[PDB]
UniProtKB/Swiss-Prot annotation, chain A:
It is found in: Nucleus; Cytoplasm. Its main location: nucleus. DNA repair protein that may operate in a postreplication repair or a cell cycle checkpoint function. May be implicated in interstrand DNA cross-link repair and in the maintenance of normal chromosome stability. Upon IFNG induction, may facilitate STAT1 activation by recruiting STAT1 to IFNGR1. Keywords: Cytoplasm, Disease variant, DNA damage, DNA repair, Fanconi anemia, Nucleus. Belongs to the multisubunit FA complex composed of FANCA, FANCB, FANCC, FANCE, FANCF, FANCG, FANCL/PHF9 and FANCM. This complex may also include HSP70. The complex is not found in FA patients. Interacts with ZBTB32. Upon IFNG induction, interacts with STAT1. Interacts with CDK1. Interacts with EIF2AK2; interaction between FA variants and EIF2AK2 may lead to augmented EIF2AK2 activation and cell death. This is Fanconi anemia group C protein. Transmembrane segments: none annotated.
Curated annotation (Swiss-Prot), chain B:
InterPro entries: Fancl, FANCL_C, FANCL_d2, FANCL_d3, FANCL_d3_sf, FancL_WD-rpt_cont_dom, UBQ-conjugating_enzyme/RWD, Znf_RING/FYVE/PHD. This is E3 ubiquitin-protein ligase FANCL. GO terms for molecular function: ubiquitin protein ligase activity; ubiquitin protein ligase binding; ubiquitin-protein transferase activity; zinc ion binding. It holds the Pfam family FANCL_d1. SMART domains: FANCL_C. Its main location: cytoplasm.
Amino acid sequence: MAQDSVDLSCDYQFWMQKLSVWDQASTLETQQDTCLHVAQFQEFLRKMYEALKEMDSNTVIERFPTIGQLLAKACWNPFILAYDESQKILIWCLCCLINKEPQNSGQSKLNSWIQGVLSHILSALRFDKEVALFTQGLGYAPIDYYPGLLKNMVLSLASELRENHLNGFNTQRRMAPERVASLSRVCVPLITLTDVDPLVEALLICHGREPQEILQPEFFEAVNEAILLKKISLPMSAVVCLWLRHLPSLEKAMLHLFEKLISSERNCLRRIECFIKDSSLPQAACHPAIFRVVDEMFRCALLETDGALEIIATIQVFTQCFVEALEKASKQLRFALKTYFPYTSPSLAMVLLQDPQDIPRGHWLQTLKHISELLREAVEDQTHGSCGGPFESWFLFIHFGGWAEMVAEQLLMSAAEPPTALLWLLAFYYGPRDGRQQRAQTMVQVKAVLGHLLAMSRSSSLSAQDLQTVAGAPAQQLIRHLLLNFLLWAPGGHTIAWDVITLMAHTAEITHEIIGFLDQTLYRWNRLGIESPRSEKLARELLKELRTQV
Amino acid sequence: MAVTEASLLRQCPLLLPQNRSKTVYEGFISAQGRDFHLRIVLPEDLQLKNARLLCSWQLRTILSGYHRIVQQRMQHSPDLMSFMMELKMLLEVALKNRQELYALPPPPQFYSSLIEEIGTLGWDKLVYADTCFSTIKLKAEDASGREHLITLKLKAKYPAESPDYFVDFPVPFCASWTPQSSLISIYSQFLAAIESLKAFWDVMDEIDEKTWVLEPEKPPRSATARRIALGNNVSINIEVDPRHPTMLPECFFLGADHVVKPLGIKLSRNIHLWDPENSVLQNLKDVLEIDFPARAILEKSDFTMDCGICYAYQLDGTIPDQVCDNSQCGQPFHQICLYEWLRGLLTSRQSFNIIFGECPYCSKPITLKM
Ligand SMILES: [Zn+2]
Ligand SMILES: [Zn+2]
């Protein structure tokens, strides 16, 4: 509550000096620059509409000088008039500048000119003469055939493009590259007007035989934006071609995942899974190129955070959609996993692909004990003819959710004489790049903590300070997460979980971290169908109440 | 230099202006240690918008499939100087492409040394030599008794730069080339690679012998893939790592969803009992708890009865219907795929409801009636 006039009064002169440049957008440059600035033009028009709406017309002369010329320039420009609600807003602006009882000559002239310009948007025959004459002859209003006219205009151009497409290197009429670029420029502003969407999908499939791209990326980015905000729903073949010809669109869309796990829906993995399955990523990641690009952005995020549980979770989900999409659309002719997963043994992947839905609850300890063996072979015996290093075999181990998480929950079940292999496995997960020295230290710390915890479980339901003792470094997240597993698993929990939660919630980061832990765990159980309903309800309750505290 | 008085001398030494008004140049133009006759008439002013350019028929054979290029360049190029740059650059291109016609080797090193060196190896070794002497292909034996071949494609200087080695076996082959190295040296490196990959070979040979390997037919030594058949109308495809052959492969099954599901379950359950001290077959038999058919049908094993464009049976109801009128191809197609295909070719012509043109695989006349 300060400026009100000033920023808009500056941007006014900017836009009026810009509209005069464009001037009915009959040329290439006027169109491309209109295509860009239109949206900010729309927001300008929102602020402008608020200002003109709250106040009244013919009375005030605030920006009334050349508002008329702005709205003329606007409306006779059709790329303006085509955008979401810019028309609707221009209508509203004009309805603000109308007068009920015009008093001086000027007000009546104004209002007539206002009806004129509305009639020019809506109901003007700026179209081929013979069709006007013929229709007027048949006694039709534009209103009652425009739709079918448009529909026929589109199906024509879409057909044309499909024959351009099929006549690849044939002595026959080659649709003019200029004209294809022309159409593409016109797809942008009315992408969310349903009577083009066949045209679009024809443009994206029908690439043709050029070394050069023909389409201008303002096309690709208009389309990308509209896919992600769900204003378009093409078929999936459309959007694999989109990705596979404009890299910054496929960046722009895997980054629009990242906003979803960061801001909106932190640890609502149902919501994240549903966004990934509705986005077409899985099916488009069946093409090995797009898999490799996507997992590069995943790798860049694994490093910015040093192994953030929230990105680990999104990988686990995404990979599960991808793996189900591979299986599905890979009968004949599929690319071999050293193609998607090139920087590891294909051996290791082929183990880690086998899901725990298809193995019994009892034989999972065996599976993990096999994984520990082959990972230790790859990491400790880091010789020629292998993975490049330990980090790579870890970034693989992430891409399987299930296996990395289940280790703690299986250690508690075998806490009496813990297997050394599991201690290796878990230590590796919470810490790569340590030296054998540091892994053995971590393992024996966890072994002592297993002793204390098994004593505490075989005892009655005890305090929270006894756990705070062992809680009191490089191995903290390991112990925290293992401890929470203990709370949820043992029936000695459901009583003293809150009692440890309150203390362990030093910061908000710990709170969010454990919440992510618990969401991952619920998603994991409800998938794998393994449950004690106590633990399920307890996790839900705790998660519900702690998401309010933050 | 900047100006085309010294710069034109420096960059066309053998173009001698005949006339004082420098309108006719005549003589030679240089490219790849070869000079060509070229006679280049200008109008009375220095405008290439109208100019003559005649050549030796030597040069014209060598500017074949460039004529429009040069005529456009005469019209589009500002100066003579740049025109000559463009013309030499284009000659540069033309010769290096038609590399089959142009190779005058220095005999005193070449044809003698190559003989000396093939003597150094032994004469049972060489198996093919090309009459241009560019290509040779040599043979080597395993301790097993398997032949493995090596092609070399050799340049104007054999002993100076590397010989391009083209090789079957599936790991990238390394040849440390010096001017001091020779055929025996690269041959010993090649033998080293053979004896190294011995295990992988035994795996492949053992498979091909004691099982019905089905899809790769007459397998090369490069192929890591073996689509094995077992029972009937189910198969397993198995992609193997050479470095750790006996170890576990990426694998999966084709066939009936109701037949394959149990094998997948059983595999996921016994997969921890993979062992790299047995053979691949001796692991697979006791993991999947089965024995294989040793050629349940050796004659009608399978002929791929798929589209040969899209490689699907059942594209939107349609069946592999349209075939080749040829004994050697016989390959089925789809109506849709073959139409989209042939419309595109330059060889195709369309009558009323007919499309004539070349079978994709064998390039023989094939007819499509919509
Ligand atoms: Zn087909
Ligand atoms: Zn054929």
